[PDB]
Amino acid sequence: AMAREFSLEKTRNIGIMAHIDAGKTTTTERILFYTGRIITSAATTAQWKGYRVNIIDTPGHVDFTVEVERSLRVLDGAVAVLDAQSGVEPQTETVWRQATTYGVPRIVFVNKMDKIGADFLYSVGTLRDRLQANAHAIQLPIGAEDNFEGIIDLVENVAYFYEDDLGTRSDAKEIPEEYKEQAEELRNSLIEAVCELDEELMDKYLEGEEITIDELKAGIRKGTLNVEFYPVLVGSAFKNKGVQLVLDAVLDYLPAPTDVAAIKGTRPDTNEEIERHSSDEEPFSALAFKVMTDPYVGKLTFFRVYSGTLDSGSYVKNSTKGKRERVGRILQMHANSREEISTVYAGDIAAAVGLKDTTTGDTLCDEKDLVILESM
Ligand SMILES: [Cl-]
Ligand SMILES: [Cl-]
Numbered sequence: 001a002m003a004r005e006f007s008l009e010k011t012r013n014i015g016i017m018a019h020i021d022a023g024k025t026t027t028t029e030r031i032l033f034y035t036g037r038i039i040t041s042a043a044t045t046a047q048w049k050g051y052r053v054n055i056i057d058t059p060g061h062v063d064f065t066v067e068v069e070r071s072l073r074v075l076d077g078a079v080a081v082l083d084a085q086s087g088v089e090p091q092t093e094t095v096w097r098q099a100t101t102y103g104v105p106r107i108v109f110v111n112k113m114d115k116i117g118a119d120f121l122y123s124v125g126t127l128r129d130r131l132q133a134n135a136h137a138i139q140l141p142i143g144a145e146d147n148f149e150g151i152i153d154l155v156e157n158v159a160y161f162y163e164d165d166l167g168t169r170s171d172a173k174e175i176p177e178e179y180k181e182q183a184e185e186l187r188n189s190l191i192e193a194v195c196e197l198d199e200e201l202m203d204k205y206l207e208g209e210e211i212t213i214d215e216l217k218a219g220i221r222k223g224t225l226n227v228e229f230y231p232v233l234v235g236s237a238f239k240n241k242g243v244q245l246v247l248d249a250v251l252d253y254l255p256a257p258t259d260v261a262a263i264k265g266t267r268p269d270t271n272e273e274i275e276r277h278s279s280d281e282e283p284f285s286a287l288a289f290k291v292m293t294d295p296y297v298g299k300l301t302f303f304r305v306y307s308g309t310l311d312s313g314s315y316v317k318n319s320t321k322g323k324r325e326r327v328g329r330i331l332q333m334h335a336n337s338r339e340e341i342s343t344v345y346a347g348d349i350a351a352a353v354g355l356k357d358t359t360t361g362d363t364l365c366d367e368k369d370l371v372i373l374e375s376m
Contacts, residue, residue, distance in 0.1 A: 004345050006052035008278060009256050011347050013304070015058045015071065017095050018081035023111045024060070027081050027237040031055060034244060036335025042290040042302045043349045045332035045339070048247045054349045062091045064098070070361055070374070072102040073263070074289045074304045074349075077254030079246060080108045084118035084234075087126035096131050103260070105224045107231050107249045113141050114148040114236040124232050135230040136193045138220065139245070140186055142179060151234060151242050152179060154187045155216055162241045169244060194219035197228060217252055224253040257347025263287075263306045265363070265371040268319055274371050276307035278347045283369035284308030284316065288362045292351070300331070300351040301358050306373070308366060309345050318355075319372045320362035327364075328354030 016031075018024035035046030035053050044055045056075045059067055078099060082088060099106060110123045120141050127135035142150035142159065150161040158172040159179070175183050191211055195202040198219050204211055223229030231253055235242020257278040265274045265285065276285045290302040310316065312330045317323070331351045332339045344350045358364065363373045 002342050004280075006047070006050075008258050008347050010050060011052040011054075011256050012048075012250050012254055013054045013056060013074070013076040013257065013347070013349065014250055014254060015056045015075035015078045016081060017058060017078050017092075017099065017106070018111075019060060019083075019089065019091060021086075021089075022081045022083045022092070023237050024081055027079075027109070027111055027243075028055065028057075030237050030240055030243040031247065032335045034247060041333050042292055042300075043333065043351070045334050045349065049251060051251050052348070053247070053250065056349070062094055064094075067360075068095075068098055069102070070287070070289055072099060072104055073373075074287065075104070076257055076260050076347075077105045077107075077250070079250065079254075080106045080230075081111050081237075082108060082123055082127075084110050084112045084120060084123050085115060087123040088130045093131055096133070100227060103227050105227060105253070105255050105259075107224065107233065107246070107253050108135060109242075109246050110232065110234045111237045113144065113234050114146060114239050114241070116145055118144050118148070120144070120234050127230065127232070133230050134193070134223075134228060135232050136190055137186055137234075138190060138231045138249075139233050139242075140179065140183055141234045142176065148236060148241070151245065152183055153245070154183065154190055155220070156213060157183075157187060160245070164239055164241070168240055191216065193229070194223065197223035197226075221253050225255050225259050257306075263373055265373040266375075268322065268370055268372055276371065276373075279307060280309050280346050282307040282346070283366040283371075284310050285363065285365045285371050285373065286310070287373050288355075288358050288364060289360055291359055297329070297331070297353050299355070300353065301355045302349065302351045303364060305344055305346050305348050305350075307346050309343055311343050312341070315367065316364045317367045317370060318358050318362050319365050319370050320374065320376060321357050323357050324367070325355050325358055325364065327352045 140152040152159045161170045195205045262275040262277045285307045286303045286305045288303045292300045294300045
C-alpha cells in the first residue's frame with residue numbers, strides 16, 4: 001500500500017552511449033556513486049536532487065542490431081560520452097545516427113579532459129563536422145591536461161574549481177579574468193543558437209531585452225527534447241571532475257517519460273494500431289528488455305513500464321507469447337542494495353521474479369486490455 005515516491009515529471013530513464021576507450025565504464029561508476037548515497041547491473045535504480053534516475057546499461061555494438069533498437073526504446077534520454085583526444089570515432093557515428101532515428105534526446109560529455117593532448121574546442125567541432133549535429137558548448141574548461149583545474153558553466157555564468165580530492169566541488173565563484181572574454185563570446189554564441197529554437201526568445205534578443213538564466217535553460221531543454229540541439233559538457237570521469245554537473249544537465253535537459261511520444265503497439269490477432277500514454281490511469285503495459293541469472297533470487301526479468309501500474313503477486317499477460325505470467329516479486333536494483341517494492345508505476349524500471357516464459361522483447365500487459373509493443 002504505497003504511492004509513487006517520485007512523479008513522472010521527476011523521473012529520468014537514461015543510458016550512456018560510448019565506447020570502452022571513451023571511458024563509458026569509469027563514467028558509469030561515478031554516476032552510480034553520486035546517485036546512490038544515503039558486476040554490471042542491467043538497470044540501476046537511483047536518485048539525484050529529488051529525481052528518480054534509472055541508469056540503463058547499453059551494449060557496445062558497431063552494427064544495426066535489434067538489441068540497440070530495444071535499448072533505445074527502454075531509455076528516454078541518453079548521455080553521449082566522447083574522448084577529448086580523438087573526439088568522434090567512426091563507431092560513435094553509427095551509434096549516434098540510430099539514436100536520432102528513434103528520436104532520443106542527448107547531452108554530450110567530453111570526458112578525459114585531464115588526459116594529455118585533451119582539446120575541448122576540437123572535440124565539440126567534430127560533432128558538427130562528422131555527425132552533422134547541432135552541438136553547442138554550455139561549458140568551457142579551465143585548463144587542460146594536469147592544468148585542468150575547473151569548469152565554467154556558461155548558462156549560470158559562473159565557474160567551479162576542483163582541488164582533485166574526495167571533496168571535489170567548491171562554491172560557485174566569479175569567472176576568472178583570463179577566461180571572461182572567451183566565456184561571454186561562447187555564452188553569446190550559445191544564446192544565439194537557442195534563439196533559433198524558440199521565437200519567443202528571438203524577439204527578446206532582437207529587442208535588446210535580457211534573456212534570463214531559466215529562459216535559456218528552457219530553450220536548451222526544448223531544443224534537446226525535439227532532437228534539434230545537443231548541449232556539450234566537459235570533465236574528467238577518471239579523476240572525478242564535472243560528473244555532478246552532468247547529473248544536473250540530465251535533470252535540466254533530458255526528458256521525463258512524458259516528454260517523449262506515447263509508445264505504439266497493436267492488439268493481438270489484428271492490424272489495429274494502439275498507443276499507450278505514460279500515465280498511471282491507463283491499462284498496464286511494459287516491455288521486458290533483459291533476463292538475468294541472479295545468484296540470490298535465481299532469475300530476474302527487467303522491464304520498462306510504459307503505462308499503468310502493477311502490484312506484486314498479481315497476474316499479467318505476456319501478449320507476445322499469449323501466456324499468463326504471475327509477477328511474484330518486484331525488485332529495484334540500487335547501487336549498494338536491493339529494494340523489494342509492492343507497486344511499480346508508469347515510466348519506471350524494475351525486475352520481476354517468478355516469470356517462466358518471458359524473454360527480452362516480450363510485452364507484459366493487463367489481461368483485460370491487450371497490446372503488443374514490439375513487432376513479430
Ligand atoms: Cl561536478
Ligand atoms: Cl503522454
